[model samples]
Target: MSQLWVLYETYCQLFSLTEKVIVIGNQLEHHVTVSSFSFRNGYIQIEKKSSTLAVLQGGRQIGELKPRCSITIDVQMTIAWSGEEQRKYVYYVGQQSEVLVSNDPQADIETTNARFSLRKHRGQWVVIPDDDAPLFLNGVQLSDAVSLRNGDVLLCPYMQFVFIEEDLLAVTSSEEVVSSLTETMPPL
Candidate 1:
C-alpha cells in the first residue's frame, strides 16, 4: 500500500511545469510564449500564447486562445495485481473505525462492540483502545495509542487481524479527486 501524500507528491513531480519561448508562423517570424501550468481534477492544464495559437489535442482542435488560454490533458495511472496473490481478503481503513470483540468482557462499559478506534494523528495512523478494551499488538497489550505499521498484528479478545503492507491494485477517476485518490492508495 502506498501513502496518499507520497503518491500525490510523486504525481506532482511527474507533470512538473516549465516555461519556454519559441518562434512560430510559416513565413513571418512570431515569438510564441508557453507559460504557466497546474493540475486540476487529475488533469494537467497548460496556458500558452503567441498572440494567436490553437490548442490541438486528441483528434480535434480545442480552440484558439487569442492572447492566453488554458488546455486540459487527462492523465491515467495504472497499478497491477493478480488473483493468485497470497492474501485475497482485505480490510480497508477509509476512516476512523474500531475492531471490537464479539463478547464484551465488561457489561457496564458499553453494549456496542467498539473496543478501540483507529485515528489519524498528524498524518499518522494510530490505534486507541478504551480503558478496559483488551487490545494487543503482536503479543503485548497496548497501554496508549500505538502507531500501526506493515506486518503489525492487531489482536482483539476473540479475533486477530494481520496488517500486511502489499502493493494495492486500485482504479479511480479524477471526478472525486482527494477521497478517490486516498481510497485507492491505502496506507498502514
Candidate 2:
C-alpha cells in the first residue's frame, strides 16, 4: 500500500471561456502508476521525456508537471514518487480575465490594485496619492518600485498611490500637493 499527497490544485470556471484544473500529487512509497490526468470541461493529455515534461491541449503544451524521481501511476490517477518538494509551482494562463471578488470599500485598495498591475515590488514599494508624499508599503520605495525588473513580484500592503499610467502629468507637476492643500484649506 502507498500513500499519496496532493501538493497543489486549482480550478477555473467562466462562461464562453476555457476552464482548466491542475492537480499535483506525490506518493510516499514506491508503488503506483498514473494512468491519466483528470480534468473537467476538457480532456487531460500529458507529454513527458527525460529532463522534460509537459501537459498538452490540442497538441500544444499548456502546462508542465515535472517529477524529480521515478514515479508510477495506477489506472485511478494514483502516483508514487521517491521524494517531493513541499512547494509546487502550478502555472495558469487564463483564457479570460476572471473577477475574483467584488470591490470592498473597507478592503486595502493598494493591494487589490497591485494584483492587476503585474508588477512586483521586491523591497518596499511606496504609493504617493495626489496631495501627499510617497508612502512606503512592504519595504520598497516609490521611485524604485516603478523600475522593477521583468517577472519581479512586489509584495506590499494597502496604501493610496499615484497610478502613473493614469495621470503622468499630475505626478510630474505636484511637488508637494499635501502641504499646499493643507496651507490653502482652513482648519478642520
Candidate 3:
C-alpha cells in the first residue's frame, strides 16, 4: 500500500572524463593513471592502475574499497533498471543529497524543471522536491518530503519512474509494468 521513491535521470553537462593521471598530494604521495572505467553488468571496474588505489571520502579512508573492486561508498541505496543493462546506482544519503536530475544524461529534462533530491529520513527513503520545481506521485503534486513505498509511480516534469522496495523483488520485472502503465496514459 506504499510507493517507493522513483529514480530519475538527468542530462547535466557539467562534467567529463579523459585519459589523464590523477596526482594525490598528501600524507602519502600517489599517482593514479586511469585508462578507463565502466559500469557493466551492475559492477564498476577500473581499467588501469586503479587497482592500487584507495577511496577517500570527506578526508576519511574507505578501508576496503580498493581499485578493481568498487561498490558505491554510499549507504547501499540502490536504483535498479530492467534489461540488458541491469545496472544499479547506489547513493549516499545524509545532509547532502543525491539529486534526482543531476546524473544519467538519458532523461534530457532540464534541471530547473525537476530539482528533486533523494535522501534517507528517519531510516526511510524520501523525496525532497525544490519549492520551484514540479514533482508528482501517482498524478498528485508534491509539496513536502514524501516517503516512498513499493509500486509507487514517481513522475518528474516529463519523465517517470517506478519505485520498488528492496524487499519487494517479485514485482521487479519493470518493462512490463511500465509498458502496461503507459498504455493507460493519454495522448500527449
Candidate 4:
C-alpha cells in the first residue's frame, strides 16, 4: 500500500503534478482504503471503495476521527539492545540520538565502542550501519537503513537490537524475550 503511494508521488513529481498529499491509509480488516484525500464541503463520494462507510458523513460514527486513523505513540521512545558478556543492558535513543552499539569494539567505527548508530528521521527511528557487514532489520537483510518499530529486530552477526517502547520493557526479562542474547552471556 505504501509502495503505491510512493509510486503515485514519484509520478506526480515526474510529471510536475503539484498535488499535495494529506492523509492516506488502508484498513484491510474494515474494508476501507483512502489515499491523499481532500474532501470538500459536502459528503465525499466513494465510487470504488466502501461507498457507504467510506463517505465522510460525520455522525456518532465519526465522533472525532472524521476521516483519518491513529495509533498509540510513545512520544519519547528508545531502543534497548543487550547481548553477551560485554553485552550491554540498555540504551536510549530519544535522549541519546548518537547512541551506538556493537558486539565488539571496532577501531574503524564512529563509536569505537560499537560500530552501529541509532538515528531518528521523519518520526521513525532507523539503525545506520557503520561497518561493511550486512544487518537484518525487521527480518530483512538491508545495508542502508530500516525504520525500527514495535517488535522490529536489528540482528547483527553477534548482537541483536530489539526496537520496542519503554512501557513494554517492565514486562520483559533477559531470558524470556531474548534467550539467544544470553546464549554466550558472561556474568556481569
In order, candidate lDDTs are 0.35, 0.26, 0.36, 0.33
Write model 3 residue lDDT over 117-176, tens digit each, in one string. 666555466777777765677756788988887566666432454545432212121122
| TM-scores of the candidates in the order shown | 0.31, 0.18, 0.32, 0.34
Clashes of 2: 17
Candidate with best lDDT: 3
**What tens-digit string does per-residue lDDT give for candidate 2 at 1-188?**
01122111121111111113333322323121222344332333343354334444445555555432222332233222212222211112122122111123432221222232222233322322221222232223333324433223222221122322211101111011121111212222
lDDT tens digits, residue span 1-188, model 1:
10000011112111111343222112233222112222223221123453343343332454553321223333322111111111123334445333332234532112232266555555455777778655557645677888877566664322334444432212121111122112333322
Pitting candidate 1 against candidate 4, the one with the higher lDDT is 1
Q: Residue 54, candidate 3: how far off, in angstroms? A: 56
lDDT of 2: 0.26
Q: In model 1, what is the error at residue 139, expressed in angstroms?
A: 0.6
lDDT of 4 by residue, 1-188 (tens): 01111112111110111222222233323222334433233222221122111223321122121111211112111112121122333333344334444445432222222256666666566778765654555435565765677776655333346655622211112232222121223322
Clashing pairs in 4: 84-87
Query: Residue 164 lDDT in model 2?
Result: 29
Ranking by TM-score: 4, 3, 1, 2
